[PDB]
Amino acid sequence: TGRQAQISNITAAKAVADVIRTCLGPKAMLKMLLDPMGGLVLTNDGHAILREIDVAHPAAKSMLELSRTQDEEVGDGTTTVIILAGEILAQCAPYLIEKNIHPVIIIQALKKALTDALEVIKQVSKPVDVENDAAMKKLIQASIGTKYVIHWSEKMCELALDAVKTVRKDLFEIDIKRYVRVEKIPGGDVLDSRVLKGVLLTNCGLFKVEMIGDEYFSFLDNCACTIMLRGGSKDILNEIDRNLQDAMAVARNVMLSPSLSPGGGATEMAVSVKLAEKAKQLEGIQQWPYQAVADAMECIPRTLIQNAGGDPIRLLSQLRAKHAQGNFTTGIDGDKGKIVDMVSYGIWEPEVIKQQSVKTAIESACLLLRVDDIVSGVRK
Amino acid sequence: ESLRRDAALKVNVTSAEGLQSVLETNLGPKGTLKMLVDGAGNIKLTKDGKVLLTEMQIQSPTAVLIARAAAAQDEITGDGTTTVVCLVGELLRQAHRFIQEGVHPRIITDGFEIARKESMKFLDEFKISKTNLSNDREFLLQVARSSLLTKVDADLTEVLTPIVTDAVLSVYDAQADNLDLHMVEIMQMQHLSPKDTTFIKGLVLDHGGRHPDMPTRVKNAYVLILNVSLEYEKTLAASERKFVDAKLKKIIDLKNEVCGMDPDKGFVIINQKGIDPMSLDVFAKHNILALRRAKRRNMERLQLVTGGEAQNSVEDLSPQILGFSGLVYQETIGEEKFTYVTENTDPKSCTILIKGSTHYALAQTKDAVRDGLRAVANVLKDKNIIPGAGAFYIALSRYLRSANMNKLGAKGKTKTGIEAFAEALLVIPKTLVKNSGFDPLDVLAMVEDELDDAQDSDETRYVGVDLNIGDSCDPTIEGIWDSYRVLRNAITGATGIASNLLLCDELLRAGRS
Amino acid sequence: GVDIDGESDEGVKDIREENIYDMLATKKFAINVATEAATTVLSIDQIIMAKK
Amino acid sequence: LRELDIVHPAVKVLVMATEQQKIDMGDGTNLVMILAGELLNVSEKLISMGLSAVEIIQGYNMARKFTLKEL
């Protein structure tokens, strides 16, 4: 009731965020679930975790719809963004339930925080040309490092980058890439693919019909592109779409935001050290809840340290000093927990990855603060 | 039916492993402190082994034997008693690795006795010889600092380091004679803060006269020991006053024989019973300090401290009875006055004035000083000083792994017993790193990397453990050192305690009430 | 300094005319007792009861 | 705290700590209990972060000497 009802809502998102802390990165851990029916689900993806679990906390139910929005854009690595919404709720404990800070005052501070965050996003902006196929090849392979299809992606990711550019082009560049039709053929080898430019069913070169147990082959000459995938196993087709069909978000994000940000949770390192410097120039009542947001920003990279088995207190001492002094291009190695910068790490992510992450986090955090209490038993 | 019998497993371990995690937190200089509170509110806060076992009540019957076996650890060592307990706790889990596979408990006991003989062979080469007759304060300040950092904080360490060094050195001589039985002088009082403690080279009296004109700070005085008292009693009244006034002039004549008119020569008296305040006016005109209500133990010590003699009757007076003191100061605190007698020509004993307020603050420094003084006392008795900072425990485990079948020539049955002992040797430096916040395994891994380079360096060196930085260091530069007799009974006592618990495969309850 | 009667809107007031000052010997001993008491609680490990 | 009966032995550290202030000065007792009580409240965040008491005790002792220099 009142402030006591908001405490249960903070711990509701805190308990869920603590489970997905280990779900980020190539070192991401797994979680096992036990339902009252006796079924067990063991996976490292937080998407199916929030869908199968029915939570008794009404505040945690709002995070289920937020995960559907984050998964609609990318879906890989964006599940852990909910932690940022949970760290802000825990950050208000010295303020909301102690200093009696009004929620709108915190929301107004988040409005200035979201505005200043986009300025920091434009500071780490690193544009790159999309005409180079080799530059775009290593870009889509970023999310592949979490799977064993890495060495298989040589004949896989090349088909996705060529099909999107046909249905993208320009107009701005806004277009519809959903006209592509991907066909999956079970059995065979993953190395076997089909290169087809046209519509699958003037001066046509040739017409032929192959032999396939599923259906036949038909070519339609236009004045649109299709993909025929041959999987290396029976049920592997589910993971193939995650590394190709779901990987189309990388090709969509590079067209909307050609700029590149540090990948593997290395972006918010330069954001947290910069947000603390922008707070000293505010000099107001809202400075304390505004500066405390940087304390919630440094909790996200600690997930890598928890995955790398390091000490987040001692390691971030030198790590935060590199982003606030040397340069903002430095980063954190997630594998071994090392200071190796993102320059030689070879992975960069678009700016929109963190843009949609912070935008949906602030919008979801303020709505949870606007709720005074929760009542039950209405019998609708 | 058969079967029945019994099985040796963790059931018997749960009694002996309970103190492991309890005594693991307070192990080392970074450890914590345990408190003992009664129904009256008195709280005694210390991690010393006295409260860990004897003053600790627990339903585990194993702690009774651990408390009885610690009697030799408290007398000989008294510091770091939790290290031996952690050695047993690691060997208990090694039983499920070995004994659970069908190894008989007697088999692994041979590895403990063989390791005891091999530890002495390694202890002889690992110790460093030092000449204690040179009165070198370099190692005395390092051993004292190593004992204080493992008990008190860094503030009390800087103050008490030179104090403890000069305390035992006063009794120490070219004959290496140090007697702690005659010299104790522990003053229990509440004043200022424990950081204000001071050192006194002589006995301090807890009694003093209430006469306002009694001089406080006096250059020197001649102590006159008197077991009787001359004052006005109920007793006819003039008969007792005749014996007092007649002997009073003899006291004044005694001051004239030593030429008390010289401002550089003072005079003082002491009595066992009370003194009439009317008679104190005579001592005030002559600037004579008086003391009443003296204990029998304090008066007997003044003969060996001040250097005079103990006299009963006032009628007998000789210059040899009066002692000598270089500094005389009297401080008034509460209802009692403490007289500081120091700067004697040849003090036979000294003391450390204790300060504090709360009860747990005094008890924390009460045992720490006596245990710290005993630690440096063994340094003067031991002509060999052992490098500390885990240099002995880490290097001993490598010596056991190198020579197994080449020297000992084990048949394979005792090979598991001699190897299990080496596994527990790294537990003591492992707890030190865990209390410092660093990862226990990663720090010990870097220490073993330097040990491998030291074997190929073809030189004599010792690898230490630094808790602050987390890398290897030099025990000489660090300053952590151990006495020879400290680790002599520690390794010997560890083999006896651990073996007695492993030989018990069954427990029963019966007897007479 | 901070003196709040009718001035709570302003928040600042001269302490020289008001002669509002703090004792120096008290503050020196305040930080000493507070630090000694705070580190004492952090040093507590386990409560021990002897024959009771 | 003298007249009150407290059944928690752990919090009694602050109760007996008042005697050090009364003997040395006798005033500012409320200031000591507020200051000492707040230092342990703000340290709760560092405990949840996993920071050992080694740097916490050293942190207060290092800042204590800096305060005496500013006085």
Side-chain angles (χ1 to χ4, degrees), chain B residues 46-57:
Chain B
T46 187
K47 64 182 178 181
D48 290 344
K50 183 178 179 180
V51 66
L52 297 176
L53 296 174
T54 300
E55 294 178 351
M56 182 178 284
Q57 185 174 355

Side-chain angles (χ1 to χ4, degrees), chain A residues 279-344:
Chain A
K280 294 176 179 177
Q281 295 300 321
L282 178 62
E283 294 177 351
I285 296 170
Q286 294 178 336
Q287 185 175 356
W288 291 96
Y290 176 78
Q291 186 174 355
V293 177
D295 291 344
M297 294 299 294
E298 63 184 343
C299 296
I300 295 170
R302 294 181 182 175
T303 59
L304 297 174
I305 295 170
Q306 293 177 336
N307 290 337
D311 186 4
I313 294 170
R314 293 179 178 84
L315 293 175
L316 293 175
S317 296
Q318 185 64 59
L319 295 173
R320 292 173 296 180
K322 292 166 62 181
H323 294 81
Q325 295 300 321
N327 190 340
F328 58 89
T329 59
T330 59
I332 296 170
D333 186 4
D335 290 344
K336 294 177 179 177
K338 302 299 182 181
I339 61 172
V340 176
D341 292 344
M342 296 297 103
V343 176
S344 63

Side-chain angles (χ1 to χ4, degrees), chain A residues 166 169 197-200 202-204 219-226:
Chain A
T166 300
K169 294 177 179 177
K197 183 178 179 180
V199 176
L200 177 63
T202 299
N203 290 337
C204 182
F219 177 80
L220 177 63
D221 181 67
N222 61 345
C223 296
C225 183
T226 59

Side-chain angles (χ1 to χ4, degrees), chain B residues 216-248:
Chain B
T216 59
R217 181 177 181 171
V218 178
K219 183 178 179 180
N220 57 33
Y222 296 141
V223 176
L224 177 63
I225 295 171
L226 295 175
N227 290 337
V228 297
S229 178
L230 296 175
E231 72 280 4
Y232 176 78
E233 62 184 343
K234 294 176 179 177
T235 300
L236 296 175
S239 178
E240 295 301 321
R241 295 176 63 185
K242 183 178 179 180
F243 295 159
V244 176
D245 290 344
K247 294 177 179 177
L248 178 63

